[PDB]
Ligand binder design. Structure first.
Ligand SMILES: N[C@H](CO)C(=O)Nc1cccc(OC(F)(F)F)c1
Ligand SMILES: [Zn+2]
Length: 285
């Protein structure tokens, strides 16, 4: 059979929180079969756990909620876990947010490869899209399409000098195109206008050219840090791979995003969950 995977070893990472600007400790540990990805606030007492589930989501990133208790910026870590097929793992946080690291999945990918993958004696469960499912917000569109594989297609028209007047598009088929090589290290575009507001208000303190391609009203300041052609939509695809993993199992199917973000990504997932005939669970031999 195709088996569930966890981590072979505990691994620890230190970074800055995206919003605090303050040091935060992350520990990844193996978990049992059928656990999924479970976030732990160990700084609290009693420790509070929040499963990585669509229904546990509550702006510019994906936040998990249980009560007043939250875990911020889950999208990149969940994307690394999606990309390497990690089914089951505990995520312990010293604080309310995942460290932003280089601001891609690359750091998490590398810590998980370094931990090692452990097969478990239990069938890996897949969510296979049977029939099309879609959500719209003004011009924003997310859509699930039946497909023999996993495929994420992203298109956005952002009205900035940087894009030279052109819609940004990227497809990724994870039969030919590797998550690790072609999406995992992509950083988002930060717009001085947006960052300037937040920093004034003591928010997004941790965000810089270390964890973002920073663009002013005109130009990418830090072209030196570009890793890919069409990096922005490649990071959007990374964001969506992370958000889609809140389904709790790998997707067999195609995702199409048009101006979509975390908000619509979560609406799509719910809408699919609601639509029991749009999907079935499969395992393989
Ligand atoms: N997932 C989201 C959206 O892609 C994300 O990657 N946000 C993000 C990443 C790094 C820095 C950052 O701060 C800022 F704003 F200053 F750039 C925001
Ligand atoms: Zn992101």
């Amino acid at each position: 059979m195709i088996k569930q995977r966890t981590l072979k070893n505990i691994i620890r990472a230190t970074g800055v929180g995206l919003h605090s600007g303050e040091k935060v400790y992350l520990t990844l540990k193996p978990a049992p079969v059928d656990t999924g990805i479970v976030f732990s606030r160990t700084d609290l007492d009693p420790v509070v756990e929040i499963p990585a589930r669509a229904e546990n989501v509550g702006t510019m990133s994906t936040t998990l909620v249980k009560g007043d208790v939250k875990v911020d910026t889950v999208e990149h870590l969940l994307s690394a876990m999606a990309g390497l097929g990690i089914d089951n793992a505990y995520v312990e946080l010293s604080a309310s947010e995942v460290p932003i690291m280089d601001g891609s999945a690359g750091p998490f990918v590398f810590l998980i490869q370094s931990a090692g993958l452990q097969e478990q004696e239990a069938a890996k469960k897949f969510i296979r899209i049977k029939r099309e499912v879609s959500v719209e917000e003004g011009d924003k569109r997310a859509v699930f399409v039946p497909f023999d594989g996993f495929k994420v297609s992203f298109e956005i028209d952002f009205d900035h000098p940087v894009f030279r007047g052109r819609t940004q598009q990227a497809s990724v088929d994870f039969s030919s195109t590797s998550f690790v090589k072609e999406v995992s290290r992509a950083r988002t575009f930060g717009f001085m206008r947006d960052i300037e507001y937040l920093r004034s208000q003591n928010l997004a303190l941790g965000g810089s050219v270390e964890n973002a391609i920073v663009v002013d009203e005109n130009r990418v300041l830090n072209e030196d840090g570009l890793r890919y052609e069409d990096e922005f939509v490649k990071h959007k695809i990374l964001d969506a791979i992370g958000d889609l993993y809140l389904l709790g199992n790998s997707l067999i199917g195609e995702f199409r995003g048009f101006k979509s973000g975390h908000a619509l990504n979560n609406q799509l997932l719910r809408t699919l969950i609601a639509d029991k005939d749009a999907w079935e669970v499969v395992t393989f031999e």
